[PDB]
Structure formats: structure tokens, C-alpha cells
Amino acid sequence: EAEKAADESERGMKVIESRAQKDEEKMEIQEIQLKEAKHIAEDADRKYEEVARKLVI
């Protein structure tokens, strides 16, 4: 019984290992995506200030 339980416990441990690795991958991908998002946001902000200036004039 103990040896079978050891096999299953290692099974579960390895499954959680793999899932955590996949999650880290998705985390870094979303991280680079978020940086790109921030840059797009700043660009839009600058464009907005510019067009406001033009309209006032």
C-alpha cells in the first residue's frame, strides 16, 4: 500500500510541476503583452494632446 501510494503521490507532484511550468510560460507572455500595451497607451496619449492643441488653435 505504501509503495503504490508513493507512486501516485509522485504522479500528482509531477502533474503539478508541469502545470506550474505552463502557467509561468503564460505569465511571461502576458507580461511582454502588458508592456506593449503600456507603450501603445502612451503613444495614444501623446496623439491626444497633439490633436487637442490643433483643435484649440
Residues near its own copies, by CB under 8 A: 2-3, 5-6, 9-10, 12-13, 16-17, 19-20, 23-24, 26-27, 30-31, 33-34, 36-38, 40-41, 44-45, 47-48, 51-52, 54-55
d(CA 38, CA 5): 49
Minimum gap (Å) between residue 4 Cβ and other proteins: 11
Minimum gap (Å) between residue 38 Cβ and its own copies: 7
> Distance of alpha carbon 1 from its chain centroid, rounded?
42
d(CA 57, CA 52): 9
